[PDB]
Amino acid sequence: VVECNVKVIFRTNRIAFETSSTVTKQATLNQISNVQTAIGLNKLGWGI
Amino acid sequence: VYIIPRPFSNFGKKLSTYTKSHKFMIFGLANNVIGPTGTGTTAVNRLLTTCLAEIPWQKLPLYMNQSEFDLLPPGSRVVECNVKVIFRTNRIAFETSSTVTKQATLNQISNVQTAIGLNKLGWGINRAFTAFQSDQPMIPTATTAPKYEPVTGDTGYRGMIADYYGADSTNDTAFGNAGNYPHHQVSSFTFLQNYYCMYQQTNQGTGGWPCLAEHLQQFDSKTVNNQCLIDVTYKPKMGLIKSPLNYKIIGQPTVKGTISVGDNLVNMRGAVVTNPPEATQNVAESTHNLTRNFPADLFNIYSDIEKSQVLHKGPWGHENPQIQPSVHIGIQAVPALTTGALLINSSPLNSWTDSMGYIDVMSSCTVMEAQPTHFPFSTEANTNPGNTIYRINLTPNSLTSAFNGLYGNGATLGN
Amino acid sequence: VYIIPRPFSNFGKKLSTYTKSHKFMIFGLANNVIGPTGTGTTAVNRLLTTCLAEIPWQKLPLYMNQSEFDLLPPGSRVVECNVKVIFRTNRIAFETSSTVTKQATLNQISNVQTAIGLNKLGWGINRAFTAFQSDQPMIPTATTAPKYEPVTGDTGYRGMIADYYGADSTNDTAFGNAGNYPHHQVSSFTFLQNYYCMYQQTNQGTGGWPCLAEHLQQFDSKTVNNQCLIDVTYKPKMGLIKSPLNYKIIGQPTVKGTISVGDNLVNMRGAVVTNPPEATQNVAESTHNLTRNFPADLFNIYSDIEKSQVLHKGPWGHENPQIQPSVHIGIQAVPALTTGALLINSSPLNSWTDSMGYIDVMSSCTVMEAQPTHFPFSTEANTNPGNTIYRINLTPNSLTSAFNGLYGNGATLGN
Amino acid sequence: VYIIPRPFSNFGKKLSTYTKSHKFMIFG
């Protein structure tokens, strides 16, 4: 293998809608989410 | 000098045009869990399924209705005909039910996908209309002969023609608070009753599912939205769509001295041809071809309702003593199925949110012709063998496009 | 907008090249007293002989050896291949013997002669290897099937392959103080074991010996010396030199719905063809042709040592459902035989001074190919009928070039 | 002068390429 690449696009995310009122979890049309990417960590840092 | 000027009968050419704004609807058929052999006859075979709905830009009725077709003079041929479609939008459900699995969401991620040649050109089959599943009901289940004409097990379903146009001022089955509506004539949505898929069996030949993905494009719907993604057209290689013109038998010696044999040594090829691939194998195939040549002049259609008959007849209508080949391209519009929000535990993906796309399609075509006569008392339109036209008959279907290529259409009937 | 970019598997193409400096030797075969029928089967026929040695720029081994050939992937085809030769010089004997006739001389008059197309294109036959004469021993005597591969009456002589390359680290017959040497690999002269000549019988057809002289050029050797007189090349019309690529049987309807018949009305020619000249006569000939068309897909080679198999296979390998023709040109290098100084009384010319020419020949070629696969789990390289290739089989040899043209090679075996 | 030109076997290099559009899903 000479070189090999990956490119990714945050095509989008989807978050649920509590109908259930139940619990706790108040139902909302609001949405606050946030992507997070990372590279070397894996190999290079302190993890698994 | 003084030349006495000759006569002339210039027979003009009618050339019409037709259009129609169809409002088609597709469903996001969940990347159709392949159904094994649609028939108890091919039993050991399967169909990888797509939602790629098929726009019948080859069945005459997409372009014109009964009358318009009905009224075309003999020798009427479709010149060119086009389709342009607009991803007018798609709609995806909203799980209220919490039930199951399928977490309720105001989110939405869907994506259009169109494709052209695949059909005809690639390795697949249009097998559609179907028979299928309960909630998370987008994958389907019963294959079936694709429906263009109307089908019936005494009750009947369908009628492309009537789907777009309604019935006759008198026809019962339609007309009615509740029966077969004029749709097109009064804007209505109607579905694109055929989707497309790929066939393949088990052992007499084998290696895996080829890659559709690299033969159809996919857009982020919302992006491509309200924008037209189709607009390809076809100028049929031979679209004589009404019984041809009769050449008249009134010349002279032997060619009407008698109705005998008038044959001659030309030294140039003049008959239609045939390939018969001898597939035989013992762990991956071994073929053999044998060109078969054959005849010519008997008719083109009959039932009159053979408007629901195919368009490009390049493989059987040899015009005059010569030859040629080619297949009408094919075209598909649709949205990959929206996946349910199946939380946590899904580590199979098989829950599918119902979603329907409203694709706006306009179809048009030309077809045209002459009505000449070269004999003073001859009744009918008339020409000469110079062209006369000629068909090439066979026991079964001629190139049954409802079953996959080898570029031209095999002449036999699938599933 | 946002199109999701499709996949791609670009399978690269291996393209190699090969060369080799062969050191060939020719003899001035005395304008070969024609030998009557080399076989007790054609008994009444003859061969006007030339010294024109044949450079086998058509037998794969002239270009590459075992391994290189051996290691070519399926679908490997020779692209082009060339030969250039240099009249490195010739040597003529010196009669010491006074004996006979042949007056001793430090004089020398010799002359090179080369020729191209003759072979294939003209009216002759490569019949060589031979069986011959005592001093003034350049004319020869026994015709014989030309040797490229190895021949044997249990003892064996030859091996083009091994002549150039030697044996295997273990093979006895070679390797040894004295057995089958690596020649090429360690510069050695070796002979051009085939010379060329013309055939012709007695009564079923007749008029005399045509004129070779006007189909080969002759130089004053010494002039042309150490200068290359050949350098022509051939780009084979169809040089698939390794078993082709298998088209896989995994598309869909009928084409694998079953392994049945999938045939179709194309209306275009798609099968290989055949001429069968009906030579019949009563004092100079009378012919009749009858085009025969035929089949296609079974294999290309087997014994693996079919590297000693021919190069341009234009008359039998139809690639995909279509067609074509043509023959690899042919090439000859040599010196007209030096005449003895046969004084006074010679009023027949038949005394010939032994002389040998060292012609320096370099051969090269390209051959190349791909190794693609379009099915996810398919084992082997694989393509599609789109091309698949197809051979056309027969009982005897296909175009047995070792017996003279009619441009293409008759398919039957001579002498 | 006159050098007799040596042989040569240039073995070419296959060099392919591959791609694929995967559609992956993550959970928060």
UniProtKB/Swiss-Prot annotation, chains B, C:
Any GO MF annotation of the entry: structural molecule activity
Domain of life: Viruses
Subcellular location: Virion
One GO-annotated biological process of the protein: clathrin-dependent endocytosis of virus by host cell
Keywords attached to this entry: Capsid protein, Clathrin-mediated endocytosis of virus by host, Host-virus interaction, T=1 icosahedral capsid protein, Viral attachment to host cell, Viral penetration into host cytoplasm, Viral penetration via permeabilization of host membrane, Virion, Virus endocytosis by host, Virus entry into host cell
Principal location class: virion
Cellular component per GO, a single term: T=1 icosahedral viral capsid
Domain remarks: The N-terminus of VP1 is sequestered within the mature capsid. It contains a phospholipase A2-like region and putative nuclear localization signals.
Function: Capsid protein self-assembles to form an icosahedral capsid with a T=1 symmetry, about 22 nm in diameter, and consisting of 60 copies of size variants of the capsid proteins, which differ in the N-terminushe capsid encapsulates the genomic ssDNA. Capsid proteins are responsible for the attachment to host cell receptors. This attachment induces virion internalization predominantly through clathrin-dependent endocytosis.
Name of protein: Capsid protein VP1
Organism from which the protein derives: Galleria mellonella densovirus (GmDNV)
Gene transcribed to yield this protein: VP
Part of the whole protein covered: 396 to 810 of 811
